[PDB]
Amino acid sequence: QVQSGILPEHCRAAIWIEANVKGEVDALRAASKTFADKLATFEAKFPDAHLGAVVAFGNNTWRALSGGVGAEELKDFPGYGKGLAPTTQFDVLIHILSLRHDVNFSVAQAAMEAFGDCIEVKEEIHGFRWVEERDLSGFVDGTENPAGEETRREVAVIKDGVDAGGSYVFVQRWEHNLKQLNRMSVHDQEMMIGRTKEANEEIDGDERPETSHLTRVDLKEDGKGLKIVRQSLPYGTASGTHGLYFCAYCARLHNIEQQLLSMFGDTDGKRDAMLRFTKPVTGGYYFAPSLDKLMA
Amino acid sequence: QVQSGILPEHCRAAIWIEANVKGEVDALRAASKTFADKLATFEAKFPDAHLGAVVAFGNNTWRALSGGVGAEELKDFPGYGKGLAPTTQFDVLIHILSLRHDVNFSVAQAAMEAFGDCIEVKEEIHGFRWVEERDLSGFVDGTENPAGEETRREVAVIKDGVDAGGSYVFVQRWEHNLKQLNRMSVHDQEMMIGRTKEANEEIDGDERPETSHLTRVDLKEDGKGLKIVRQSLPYGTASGTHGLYFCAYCARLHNIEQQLLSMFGDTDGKRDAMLRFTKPVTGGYYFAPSLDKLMA
Ligand code: HEM
Ligand code: HEM
């Protein structure tokens, strides 16, 4: 039911392909089935790679494909924080993840043979897990991510309805200014995130500024926290552009919206303290149908 | 003696940084020691990663540093064929390789901290071994590469003299047109390379055109083969620029030159059949000193 790329944990490398439709939207129908078929035999060929992939679609493109059944919450990625979080909403998102760069590249090439004549690629980002699974800033990223199979399922996978087995996807590429980050003392960095750096222990939410990243994103509704499955990975070049490619899956887009509203100032006027050294430069929302509904 | 990045076999990832000198050349001296020191501590923290690196210098840059003793064959890359092989000779080449992307990136960031104020990066290329050690063309790459330690020393590391422990380096980034390649039938591609594609069997030098790649580069002097130690890896993006980052070390730049003369029409009038689908777009010669003469 669920596409294979949502639930796996601890991937070491990933490819994200963002693209707009080229020509008639209807060509995505056969391209998606061809890629899913190739994807399947790839996964049985390389079991030790823990390969997964998900194909997701933007609002206008999915409405034409659905159509326009389900995916109520899906909409074009708006702004947040008055341009602080820009919008670069595209039509198709392909996320490939596994333990191996070489397998990911064969799958991304298979995707490009399937979708080549009906998409125009806008960015292809190669993520990699860094040493000790730390963000390039030096902080461990992903500790409080849900785990494992059953919990991640209830957070990310739609349980019933037309969109059962589906999921909502948010992708946002950040560009780190590590020079600006290494201005701050390690203590100042820890107040910015909410956890100590080398030790990755959560700082109490009263000895920690309200602008801290954890205070921004640790949100509760009806006494229950709004959870997401994060598949983010560092990306880029040492001498050039680098940062975090943020990727989140959730059964409801609402959880992701609430955290963006908090982080970028549209909830209580306060902004995430990480904006002192890094900035998002892309942003889009996508609905990932079930592997079944992908008509493959 | 020898720098750690020349001899190791079976690396899974590599980073190449080509750059020009930014400011005065003398700043390279303390930078090279600072990086090579950090290099050794990285090798100690990751002893199982087969980590190595080499810092090499262009003609003018090395002549100043040398200066100008040794590196008799060192010179600016010409290059070849009235633009058939372009030349982009820079001053500094940093090559990092190991079994791990995450380790290589940390080493690359350490190099940018040591060299960041005396170099201007022109390109940073991230190489990865592809499935079955094949080139993105689908042909296995590396088969007749010298192996292992003893033979690779004989080929790549200078034995006697003031340059003992050093090596000559050629880097050349190619861009594959895989649409134009998958034009051709398998038999056509095999006649282009000189080896069978699936089984990687060498086709006999009698059943293959003189323009075949193997015929171009399998050369002999005094009845003895002109060997090189290649460290080339695929690079790039599925939907955009991709191909082979070519990289070779040799005790004599003369072995690399003759193969270049042959491939690009200066020896037979004939040129390498691989130009039917791939093209070089960068090119530089560098001299990698011994680790000790690197003042480090
Ligand atoms: C440059 C961009 C970002 C960086 C460097 C970053 C870094 C971090 C770090 C270091 C942690 C603590 C380790 C962990 O538990 O995962 C964390 C946690 C978290 N992040 Fe991010 N983050 C970024 C963007 C975002 C965005 C845009 C969102 C949401 C839209 C988000 C959602 C979360 C959540 C929900 C947690 C877990 C909070 C908890 O329940 O403890 N992050 N992030
Ligand atoms: C896009 C460019 C290139 C591609 C795709 C490519 C690919 C290959 C392949 C598939 C082989 C046969 C497998 C092997 O034994 O390694 C090979 C062999 C070889 N290549 Fe390349 N190559 C390229 C450029 C070059 C260049 C520029 C040089 C020299 C400057 C070179 C030197 C060699 C040598 C010396 C061999 C060993 C041949 C033998 O002794 O049997 N290659 N290459």
XYZ file of C-alpha atoms and ligand atoms in Angstrom:
678
model
C 0.000 0.000 0.000
C 2.389 2.679 1.249
C 5.194 3.775 -1.049
C 8.502 2.245 0.013
C 10.361 5.521 0.640
C 8.433 6.892 3.614
C 9.000 4.451 6.469
C 12.665 3.229 6.255
C 15.066 4.676 8.809
C 18.763 5.537 8.905
C 19.347 6.007 5.177
C 22.883 7.137 4.385
C 22.176 8.868 1.054
C 19.216 10.216 -0.883
C 18.285 11.902 -4.152
C 15.447 14.440 -4.364
C 14.204 15.439 -7.828
C 11.865 18.437 -8.066
C 10.267 19.088 -11.444
C 7.450 20.792 -13.302
C 5.232 18.990 -15.798
C 6.420 19.118 -19.430
C 3.478 18.831 -21.808
C 0.312 16.878 -21.046
C -0.187 15.861 -17.410
C -1.599 12.533 -18.594
C 1.879 11.226 -19.459
C 2.649 11.048 -15.723
C 0.242 8.093 -15.589
C 2.388 5.671 -17.600
C 5.670 7.168 -16.372
C 4.685 6.482 -12.757
C 3.782 2.852 -13.428
C 7.002 2.213 -15.356
C 9.118 3.688 -12.560
C 7.302 1.745 -9.826
C 7.906 -1.486 -11.752
C 11.614 -0.697 -12.138
C 11.744 0.444 -8.500
C 10.350 -2.909 -7.367
C 12.957 -5.020 -9.155
C 15.667 -2.655 -7.881
C 14.517 -3.267 -4.305
C 14.626 -7.063 -4.754
C 17.996 -6.822 -6.496
C 19.637 -4.833 -3.656
C 18.026 -5.957 -0.380
C 21.052 -4.916 1.680
C 20.723 -1.328 0.421
C 17.343 -0.778 2.166
C 16.142 1.072 -0.930
C 12.983 3.158 -0.847
C 11.390 5.742 -3.105
C 8.315 7.959 -3.164
C 6.702 9.837 -6.038
C 4.551 12.773 -4.966
C 2.647 15.495 -6.794
C 1.846 19.180 -6.412
C -1.612 20.630 -5.953
C -2.553 21.496 -9.536
C -0.859 18.407 -10.965
C -2.421 16.045 -8.421
C -5.881 17.591 -8.814
C -5.702 16.860 -12.548
C -4.545 13.307 -11.755
C -6.831 12.472 -8.830
C -9.152 14.088 -9.899
C -10.068 15.942 -7.983
C -10.759 13.328 -5.313
C -9.230 13.448 -1.840
C -6.059 15.198 -0.698
C -8.195 17.949 0.842
C -5.336 19.476 2.825
C -3.078 19.792 -0.220
C -2.448 23.298 -1.563
C 0.375 25.277 -3.109
C 3.120 25.952 -0.562
C 2.272 29.491 0.600
C 4.710 31.895 2.115
C 5.760 32.025 5.721
C 7.220 34.951 7.629
C 6.735 37.506 4.831
C 9.204 35.911 2.438
C 11.430 34.476 5.162
C 10.342 31.031 3.928
C 10.087 31.393 0.128
C 7.815 29.318 -2.081
C 9.149 27.280 -5.012
C 6.220 24.913 -5.555
C 6.679 22.437 -8.417
C 4.599 19.658 -9.953
C 6.445 16.378 -9.260
C 8.712 15.292 -6.404
C 10.780 12.091 -6.526
C 12.572 11.124 -3.302
C 14.956 8.152 -3.456
C 16.761 6.944 -0.341
C 18.879 3.964 0.677
C 22.189 3.035 2.255
C 24.140 3.323 -1.015
C 24.904 6.200 -3.378
C 25.415 3.890 -6.342
C 21.995 2.231 -6.021
C 20.290 5.604 -5.562
C 21.831 6.819 -8.823
C 20.601 3.813 -10.801
C 17.097 4.444 -9.459
C 17.259 8.175 -10.227
C 18.355 7.274 -13.766
C 15.420 4.875 -14.024
C 13.124 7.688 -12.887
C 14.620 9.938 -15.551
C 13.979 7.408 -18.307
C 10.377 6.986 -17.144
C 9.585 10.691 -16.594
C 12.096 12.306 -18.975
C 9.645 13.272 -21.728
C 7.035 14.678 -19.341
C 8.933 16.587 -16.621
C 11.359 19.517 -16.550
C 13.747 19.087 -13.620
C 14.253 22.220 -11.494
C 16.685 20.866 -8.918
C 18.237 17.489 -8.146
C 19.789 17.407 -4.667
C 22.048 14.632 -3.384
C 21.794 14.255 0.380
C 24.291 12.365 2.508
C 24.359 11.404 6.171
C 27.307 13.129 7.810
C 29.554 11.853 10.604
C 27.534 10.861 13.695
C 24.374 11.847 11.774
C 25.089 15.487 12.599
C 23.817 18.434 10.604
C 26.653 20.384 8.979
C 26.218 22.876 11.843
C 27.575 20.171 14.161
C 24.302 19.301 15.930
C 22.867 15.793 15.786
C 19.766 15.832 13.590
C 16.977 13.272 13.846
C 17.183 12.106 17.466
C 13.531 12.736 18.379
C 12.250 11.460 15.025
C 9.563 8.797 15.563
C 10.710 5.172 15.613
C 10.042 2.687 14.424
C 7.710 0.984 11.958
C 4.386 1.178 13.797
C 4.836 4.664 15.271
C 6.188 6.110 12.014
C 3.191 4.560 10.239
C 0.627 6.311 12.450
C 2.435 9.660 12.078
C 3.131 9.592 8.326
C 0.678 7.178 6.634
C -2.987 8.003 6.005
C -5.063 5.301 7.680
C -8.390 5.207 5.836
C -10.356 6.853 3.046
C -9.607 7.532 -0.588
C -6.019 8.519 0.312
C -5.322 5.520 2.567
C -1.671 4.531 2.292
C -0.903 8.075 1.113
C 1.067 10.842 2.802
C 1.775 14.581 2.610
C 5.326 15.761 1.871
C 7.138 19.023 2.626
C 10.596 19.705 1.150
C 12.688 22.798 1.884
C 16.353 23.367 1.059
C 18.439 25.381 3.536
C 21.785 27.064 2.776
C 24.082 27.209 5.809
C 26.438 30.127 6.436
C 28.938 28.260 8.604
C 31.118 31.369 8.863
C 28.137 33.157 10.426
C 27.442 30.081 12.571
C 31.006 29.886 13.890
C 30.588 33.475 15.070
C 28.337 32.174 17.840
C 29.853 30.497 20.865
C 28.872 26.877 21.437
C 26.598 27.998 24.273
C 24.820 30.493 22.006
C 24.446 27.692 19.447
C 22.871 25.489 22.118
C 20.342 28.185 23.032
C 19.570 28.516 19.317
C 18.771 24.800 18.905
C 17.577 23.737 22.364
C 19.975 20.798 22.840
C 23.629 20.716 23.806
C 25.915 20.270 20.818
C 28.446 17.489 21.413
C 26.211 15.658 23.922
C 22.780 16.067 22.238
C 20.871 16.349 25.526
C 17.643 18.343 25.405
C 17.795 21.623 27.314
C 14.851 22.198 29.647
C 12.130 24.369 28.135
C 12.585 27.126 30.713
C 16.379 27.435 30.579
C 16.044 27.816 26.807
C 14.879 30.822 24.749
C 11.450 30.736 23.144
C 13.199 31.364 19.808
C 15.091 28.084 20.194
C 14.411 25.593 17.450
C 12.894 22.971 19.765
C 10.447 25.429 21.350
C 9.377 26.456 17.837
C 8.632 22.943 16.556
C 7.574 20.988 19.692
C 3.859 21.766 19.413
C 0.866 20.036 20.996
C -2.814 19.797 20.050
C -5.439 18.308 22.392
C -2.585 17.438 24.726
C -0.924 15.416 21.929
C 2.151 16.625 20.084
C 2.028 17.271 16.346
C 4.515 14.692 15.048
C 6.236 14.365 11.651
C 8.598 11.886 9.975
C 11.775 13.735 8.975
C 14.001 12.331 6.214
C 16.288 15.374 5.980
C 19.972 15.072 5.054
C 22.954 17.408 4.652
C 23.817 18.273 1.068
C 26.239 20.175 -1.060
C 29.871 21.094 -1.448
C 32.548 21.928 1.117
C 33.807 25.032 -0.742
C 30.427 26.196 -2.073
C 26.757 25.969 -1.244
C 25.868 23.546 1.540
C 23.274 23.014 4.229
C 20.327 20.824 5.124
C 17.767 19.539 2.639
C 14.693 19.320 4.856
C 12.181 16.585 4.073
C 9.094 15.759 6.148
C 6.251 13.248 5.833
C 3.011 13.472 7.781
C -0.459 11.961 7.625
C -1.810 15.532 7.796
C -0.228 18.562 6.157
C -1.653 20.491 9.137
C 1.131 19.334 11.465
C 3.743 20.683 9.071
C 1.932 24.002 8.537
C 1.708 24.650 12.291
C 5.458 24.213 12.672
C 6.246 26.554 9.752
C 3.868 29.170 11.165
C 5.665 28.921 14.512
C 9.209 28.888 13.103
C 8.817 31.871 10.774
C 6.824 34.198 13.022
C 3.181 33.930 11.913
C 1.952 32.501 15.251
C 3.439 34.512 18.144
C 5.642 37.017 16.290
C 8.758 35.081 17.363
C 11.089 33.438 14.842
C 13.301 30.364 14.912
C 16.780 31.301 16.120
C 18.426 29.192 13.409
C 17.718 32.041 10.974
C 20.811 33.668 12.515
C 23.030 31.403 10.393
C 20.939 29.567 7.775
C 18.072 30.324 5.434
C 15.586 28.335 3.349
C 15.706 28.985 -0.375
C 13.119 26.482 -1.623
C 9.772 25.214 -0.414
C 6.943 23.035 -1.670
C 4.073 20.788 -0.632
C 3.352 17.434 -2.281
C 0.898 14.569 -1.837
C 2.399 11.074 -2.050
C -0.325 8.585 -3.059
C -0.307 4.975 -1.984
C 1.795 2.652 -4.122
C -1.551 1.159 -5.154
C -3.099 4.476 -6.220
C 0.092 5.201 -8.205
C -1.635 2.623 -10.445
C 1.406 0.405 -9.849
C 57.190 9.602 1.931
C 54.264 9.194 -0.473
C 51.032 11.076 0.067
C 48.209 8.847 1.266
C 45.804 9.313 -1.653
C 47.755 7.878 -4.603
C 47.902 4.121 -3.946
C 44.695 3.013 -2.118
C 42.413 0.757 -4.150
C 38.656 0.252 -4.364
C 37.598 3.647 -3.033
C 33.826 4.236 -3.039
C 33.834 8.053 -3.056
C 36.201 10.908 -3.790
C 36.253 14.697 -3.713
C 38.379 16.701 -6.161
C 38.982 20.420 -5.553
C 40.652 22.462 -8.303
C 41.557 26.045 -7.412
C 43.775 28.992 -8.247
C 46.184 30.652 -5.830
C 44.447 33.553 -4.064
C 47.048 36.104 -3.031
C 50.686 35.174 -2.429
C 51.850 31.625 -3.183
C 53.885 31.412 0.033
C 50.647 31.032 2.026
C 50.329 27.491 0.619
C 53.250 26.298 2.759
C 51.649 26.646 6.192
C 48.290 25.655 4.698
C 49.690 22.381 3.362
C 51.200 21.486 6.745
C 48.009 22.481 8.576
C 45.887 20.290 6.294
C 48.237 17.300 6.184
C 48.380 17.333 9.986
C 44.574 17.297 10.168
C 44.603 14.619 7.460
C 46.602 12.301 9.723
C 44.240 12.784 12.665
C 41.323 11.946 10.355
C 43.074 8.759 9.249
C 43.525 7.888 12.933
C 39.864 8.474 13.816
C 38.692 6.434 10.786
C 41.272 3.657 10.319
C 38.778 1.362 8.564
C 37.722 3.942 5.941
C 40.860 3.547 3.772
C 41.106 7.324 3.805
C 43.767 9.108 1.776
C 44.437 12.511 0.255
C 46.952 14.236 -2.004
C 47.762 17.920 -2.537
C 49.268 18.686 -5.955
C 50.388 21.911 -7.625
C 50.365 23.383 -11.116
C 53.482 24.323 -13.051
C 53.919 28.005 -12.172
C 52.761 27.403 -8.599
C 55.098 24.483 -8.042
C 57.975 26.256 -9.816
C 57.699 29.037 -7.230
C 57.402 26.580 -4.341
C 59.937 24.124 -5.743
C 61.844 26.193 -6.741
C 62.495 25.453 -9.388
C 64.273 22.160 -8.752
C 62.770 18.941 -10.027
C 59.406 18.290 -11.650
C 61.294 18.323 -14.944
C 58.294 17.075 -16.918
C 55.783 19.340 -15.159
C 54.142 21.903 -17.438
C 50.805 23.601 -18.045
C 48.284 21.289 -19.666
C 48.412 22.275 -23.367
C 45.868 20.681 -24.330
C 44.941 18.843 -27.522
C 43.106 18.819 -30.825
C 42.344 22.521 -31.394
C 39.873 22.455 -28.520
C 39.118 18.731 -28.701
C 40.688 18.454 -25.238
C 40.342 21.889 -23.605
C 42.817 23.105 -21.005
C 41.828 24.598 -17.634
C 45.166 24.622 -15.828
C 44.769 25.756 -12.237
C 47.250 26.082 -9.375
C 46.088 23.660 -6.662
C 44.483 20.212 -6.796
C 43.182 18.478 -3.679
C 42.081 14.857 -4.073
C 40.379 13.058 -1.169
C 39.245 9.437 -1.339
C 38.012 6.671 0.976
C 35.127 4.247 1.441
C 32.842 6.877 2.988
C 31.206 10.065 1.732
C 30.784 11.454 5.242
C 34.481 11.060 6.046
C 35.517 12.673 2.738
C 33.300 15.702 3.356
C 34.804 16.267 6.804
C 38.277 16.085 5.246
C 37.186 18.466 2.475
C 35.929 20.946 5.057
C 39.231 20.661 6.921
C 41.029 21.509 3.672
C 38.805 24.547 3.108
C 39.663 25.735 6.625
C 43.408 25.378 5.967
C 43.426 26.745 2.394
C 40.339 28.972 2.417
C 42.200 32.290 2.337
C 44.904 31.390 -0.208
C 42.854 29.522 -2.845
C 39.901 30.312 -5.104
C 37.953 27.150 -5.876
C 37.086 26.656 -9.551
C 35.190 23.369 -9.182
C 34.599 20.742 -6.496
C 33.669 17.330 -7.912
C 32.166 14.511 -5.842
C 32.971 11.130 -7.374
C 31.182 7.892 -6.531
C 31.792 4.305 -7.528
C 28.780 3.105 -9.499
C 27.139 -0.336 -9.519
C 29.554 -3.140 -10.517
C 32.371 -0.557 -10.726
C 30.988 0.465 -14.119
C 31.325 3.796 -15.870
C 27.986 5.532 -16.396
C 28.278 4.174 -19.951
C 27.722 0.747 -18.392
C 31.268 -0.474 -19.115
C 33.359 -1.661 -16.171
C 36.122 0.869 -15.482
C 39.364 -0.014 -13.704
C 39.994 -3.597 -14.871
C 43.528 -3.236 -16.263
C 44.440 -0.682 -13.604
C 47.658 -1.821 -11.871
C 47.153 -3.834 -8.683
C 48.110 -3.829 -6.010
C 50.458 -1.926 -3.708
C 53.823 -3.002 -5.122
C 52.846 -2.641 -8.783
C 50.989 0.638 -8.167
C 54.115 2.032 -6.492
C 56.203 1.030 -9.519
C 53.785 2.832 -11.835
C 52.756 5.951 -9.911
C 55.430 6.937 -7.347
C 58.807 8.344 -8.386
C 61.592 6.086 -7.153
C 64.937 7.934 -7.235
C 66.095 11.532 -7.094
C 64.899 14.763 -5.548
C 61.291 14.027 -6.594
C 61.300 10.548 -5.035
C 57.973 9.875 -3.357
C 56.139 12.337 -5.618
C 53.864 11.835 -8.607
C 52.432 13.579 -11.669
C 48.646 13.995 -11.843
C 46.234 14.540 -14.714
C 42.595 15.459 -14.035
C 40.032 15.812 -16.820
C 36.270 16.042 -16.288
C 34.241 14.375 -19.044
C 30.526 14.898 -19.757
C 28.639 11.839 -21.020
C 25.818 12.240 -23.525
C 23.992 9.057 -22.532
C 21.237 9.731 -25.075
C 23.871 9.649 -27.813
C 25.461 6.553 -26.270
C 22.200 4.616 -25.990
C 21.795 5.497 -29.668
C 24.291 2.770 -30.374
C 23.816 -0.963 -30.276
C 25.769 -2.978 -27.729
C 28.093 -4.263 -30.457
C 28.702 -0.657 -31.564
C 29.608 0.374 -28.017
C 31.910 -2.630 -27.620
C 33.703 -1.707 -30.847
C 34.011 1.817 -29.407
C 35.593 0.647 -26.131
C 37.513 -2.513 -27.032
C 35.907 -4.744 -24.386
C 32.619 -6.620 -24.233
C 30.067 -4.648 -22.241
C 28.320 -7.202 -20.009
C 31.176 -9.687 -19.562
C 34.013 -7.095 -19.613
C 36.211 -9.321 -21.796
C 39.006 -7.655 -23.759
C 38.313 -7.874 -27.485
C 41.432 -8.936 -29.352
C 43.545 -6.247 -31.003
C 42.671 -7.543 -34.478
C 38.890 -7.684 -34.076
C 38.530 -4.076 -32.942
C 38.921 -0.718 -34.714
C 42.111 1.271 -34.277
C 39.920 4.097 -32.940
C 38.795 1.887 -30.063
C 39.659 3.327 -26.685
C 41.878 0.394 -25.693
C 43.853 0.639 -28.950
C 44.259 4.379 -28.328
C 45.651 3.954 -24.802
C 47.365 0.528 -24.734
C 50.812 1.839 -25.660
C 54.325 0.423 -25.406
C 57.799 1.935 -25.062
C 60.902 -0.270 -25.321
C 58.518 -3.212 -25.572
C 57.078 -2.302 -22.160
C 53.591 -0.946 -21.551
C 53.081 2.704 -20.642
C 51.061 2.219 -17.448
C 49.173 4.712 -15.263
C 47.288 4.465 -11.976
C 43.781 5.768 -12.658
C 41.555 6.975 -9.814
C 38.634 8.030 -11.999
C 35.058 7.904 -10.718
C 31.589 8.719 -12.031
C 30.153 12.035 -10.936
C 27.178 14.225 -11.378
C 23.441 14.231 -11.546
C 20.889 11.915 -13.147
C 18.909 14.713 -14.873
C 21.790 17.125 -15.571
C 25.532 17.027 -16.095
C 27.108 13.638 -15.449
C 30.007 11.542 -16.651
C 33.511 10.494 -15.629
C 35.972 12.546 -13.614
C 39.208 11.191 -15.066
C 42.207 11.170 -12.740
C 45.564 9.436 -13.097
C 48.869 9.310 -11.212
C 52.142 8.326 -12.832
C 55.849 8.403 -12.034
C 56.320 10.098 -15.429
C 53.930 12.626 -16.935
C 55.178 11.220 -20.276
C 52.954 8.128 -19.978
C 49.840 10.263 -19.610
C 50.903 12.604 -22.439
C 51.407 9.813 -25.000
C 47.973 8.410 -24.267
C 46.597 11.936 -24.729
C 48.475 12.385 -28.028
C 46.972 9.099 -29.225
C 43.354 9.671 -28.154
C 43.180 13.194 -29.590
C 44.561 12.749 -33.109
C 48.221 13.735 -32.738
C 49.759 10.238 -33.069
C 47.799 8.417 -35.802
C 45.433 11.050 -37.177
C 42.890 8.741 -35.567
C 40.978 9.840 -32.481
C 39.258 8.005 -29.660
C 35.855 6.591 -30.584
C 34.454 7.603 -27.187
C 34.280 11.184 -28.480
C 31.149 9.921 -30.245
C 29.270 10.237 -26.921
C 31.454 11.967 -24.280
C 33.644 15.104 -24.215
C 36.316 16.480 -21.865
C 35.679 20.003 -20.581
C 38.484 20.481 -18.050
C 42.161 19.566 -18.012
C 45.188 20.127 -15.803
C 48.611 18.736 -14.874
C 49.738 18.793 -11.257
C 52.791 17.596 -9.356
C 52.021 15.867 -6.066
C 55.158 16.007 -3.882
C 56.018 13.416 -1.286
C 54.258 13.809 2.056
C 57.545 14.790 3.711
C 58.595 17.347 1.075
C 55.097 18.800 1.560
C 56.719 20.104 4.775
C 54.117 18.026 6.589
C 18.343 24.368 8.556
C 17.218 23.730 8.892
C 17.064 22.842 10.151
C 18.007 22.398 11.003
C 19.540 22.608 10.970
C 17.340 21.619 12.022
C 17.957 20.986 13.075
C 17.334 20.245 14.048
C 17.979 19.644 15.195
C 19.484 19.739 15.526
C 17.053 18.999 15.908
C 17.280 18.221 17.222
C 17.579 16.753 16.939
C 16.304 15.996 16.667
O 15.606 15.609 17.641
O 15.981 15.774 15.470
C 15.779 19.170 15.243
C 14.575 18.654 15.674
C 13.359 18.828 15.060
N 13.151 19.543 13.901
Fe 14.561 20.524 12.789
N 15.989 21.624 11.761
C 15.770 22.370 10.626
C 14.538 22.613 10.045
C 13.320 22.121 10.471
C 12.011 22.455 9.935
C 11.777 23.453 8.778
C 11.092 21.763 10.637
C 9.548 21.723 10.493
C 8.864 22.244 9.471
C 11.792 20.963 11.620
C 11.200 20.098 12.519
C 11.807 19.487 13.599
C 11.155 18.693 14.625
C 9.647 18.361 14.700
C 12.084 18.298 15.498
C 11.832 17.422 16.747
C 11.394 18.266 17.941
C 11.083 17.355 19.104
O 9.949 16.808 19.161
O 11.972 17.168 19.975
N 13.145 21.203 11.491
N 15.990 19.939 14.107
C 35.115 9.569 -20.493
C 36.386 9.176 -20.588
C 36.859 7.723 -20.372
C 36.131 6.608 -20.151
C 34.589 6.452 -20.061
C 37.060 5.498 -20.014
C 36.725 4.184 -19.781
C 37.591 3.108 -19.800
C 37.218 1.712 -19.822
C 35.771 1.179 -19.830
C 38.337 0.982 -19.841
C 38.439 -0.558 -19.863
C 38.415 -1.096 -18.432
C 39.759 -0.936 -17.763
O 40.664 -1.774 -18.028
O 39.931 0.022 -16.962
C 39.465 1.886 -19.823
C 40.798 1.523 -19.834
C 41.863 2.397 -19.830
N 41.749 3.768 -19.915
Fe 40.051 4.885 -19.970
N 38.342 5.992 -20.141
C 38.262 7.351 -20.369
C 39.327 8.206 -20.556
C 40.664 7.874 -20.456
C 41.799 8.771 -20.582
C 41.687 10.287 -20.872
C 42.915 8.034 -20.421
C 44.403 8.461 -20.440
C 44.800 9.732 -20.350
C 42.513 6.669 -20.171
C 43.367 5.623 -19.941
C 43.025 4.297 -19.874
C 43.965 3.203 -19.767
C 45.493 3.366 -19.690
C 43.276 2.063 -19.734
C 43.893 0.643 -19.624
C 43.804 -0.040 -20.987
C 44.574 -1.341 -21.011
O 45.809 -1.319 -20.771
O 43.944 -2.402 -21.271
N 41.144 6.603 -20.205
N 38.969 3.172 -19.797
